[PDB]
Amino acid sequence: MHLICQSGDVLSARYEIVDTLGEGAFGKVVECIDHKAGGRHVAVKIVKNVDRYCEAARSEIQVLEHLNTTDPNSTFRCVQMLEWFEHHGHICIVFELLGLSTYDFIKENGFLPFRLDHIRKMAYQICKSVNFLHSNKLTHTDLKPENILFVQSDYTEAYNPKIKRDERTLINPDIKVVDFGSATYDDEHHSTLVSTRHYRAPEVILALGWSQPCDVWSIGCILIEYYLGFTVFPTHDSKEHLAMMERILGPLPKHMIQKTRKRKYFHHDRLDWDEHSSAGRYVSRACKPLKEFMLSQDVEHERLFDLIQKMLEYDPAKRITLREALKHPFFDLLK
Numbered sequence: 001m002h003l004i005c006q007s008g009d010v011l012s013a014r015y016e017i018v019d020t021l022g023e024g025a026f027g028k029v030v031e032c033i034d035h036k037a038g039g040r041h042v043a044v045k046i047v048k049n050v051d052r053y054c055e056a057a058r059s060e061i062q063v064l065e066h067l068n069t070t071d072p073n074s075t076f077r078c079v080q081m082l083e084w085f086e087h088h089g090h091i092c093i094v095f096e097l098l099g100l101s102t103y104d105f106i107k108e109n110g111f112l113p114f115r116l117d118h119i120r121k122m123a124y125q126i127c128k129s130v131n132f133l134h135s136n137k138l139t140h141t142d143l144k145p146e147n148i149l150f151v152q153s154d155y156t157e158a159y160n161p162k163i164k165r166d167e168r169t170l171i172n173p174d175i176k177v178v179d180f181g182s183a184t185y186d187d188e189h190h191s192t193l194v195s196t197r198h199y200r201a202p203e204v205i206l207a208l209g210w211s212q213p214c215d216v217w218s219i220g221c222i223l224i225e226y227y228l229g230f231t232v233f234p235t236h237d238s239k240e241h242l243a244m245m246e247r248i249l250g251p252l253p254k255h256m257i258q259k260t261r262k263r264k265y266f267h268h269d270r271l272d273w274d275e276h277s278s279a280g281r282y283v284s285r286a287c288k289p290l291k292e293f294m295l296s297q298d299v300e301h302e303r304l305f306d307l308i309q310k311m312l313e314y315d316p317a318k319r320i321t322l323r324e325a326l327k328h329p330f331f332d333l334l335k
């Protein structure tokens, strides 16, 4: 992967690399000039020549062809795939070029949260875009700030007292949803999920079966991270994740504890947690009830945290759907 990606390289006898936009576990994303389409700047996703990543890239191409046909106008803000090809055995997917990811923008902005009015517009477009996936019998499973990309990330800088530092602000906060390598149809086989992120729905952790509601859980964690600048579940361990949920959201439902086959996490009916160990001391300091994370008692802030609490409902059946989430009072200002 280190060898076929540098700048100046030409792919498929038309795409000329000019910049690197990101490097991850699957491989690379590079910016290219398409010399056979008037010099249109495109984004090309270079996938490692590994079995699991090639199979995911093949499934993502099939999903993208379906979404491009079902939504040719891209009304529902899924990224448009232009074409795909192979290059030295690596699978390459050409995309319409977008801006920075919301994680990238947050990082390059000193990890400062977004203004509430921008969170509102972004949350609405994310819910509409992922509801489009759900209407087409699809589940994304890997929703996170890195996979939410601004259409255009031009900004302005200004100093902010109270923060006592410079703060960037989007000009246009329009976004798109990317990465469909883990996208799963309802009729397809549902796995038990890779290290998906510090966003793992409780039904996913407890192996109770998952579907569309697990996307709603991820969006709720996306919103609080947009509102704070940091995730509320800073961990990669599953039992530690469950202990953070109990501190932030409350106790797990008894029925979910009863059915789960992951006895590894539990001691009888309670979570097998030592709150005086290293991790237990961290969870105590880093975690608190959800509402205590609020930075203002303004009603618009309580409308947002009402939406997050509904999206962070433990039971996947009780959990609000994106169809109902788009009717929430938090989005009344947009109408």
Ligand SMILES: COC[C@@H](CC(C)C)NC1=N/C(=C\c2ccc3ncsc3c2)C(=O)N1
Pocket (backbone or CB within 6 Å): 021, 022, 023, 024, 025, 027, 028, 029, 043, 045, 079, 095, 096, 097, 098, 099, 100, 101, 104, 146, 147, 149, 178, 179, 180
């Ligand atoms: C390195 O992975 C993290 C992450 C990359 C982002 C942080 C940039 N993953 C990601 N990007 C994708 C697609 C895409 C499409 C258009 C586009 N236009 C400018 S960047 C860009 C990316 C995808 O399928 N996965």
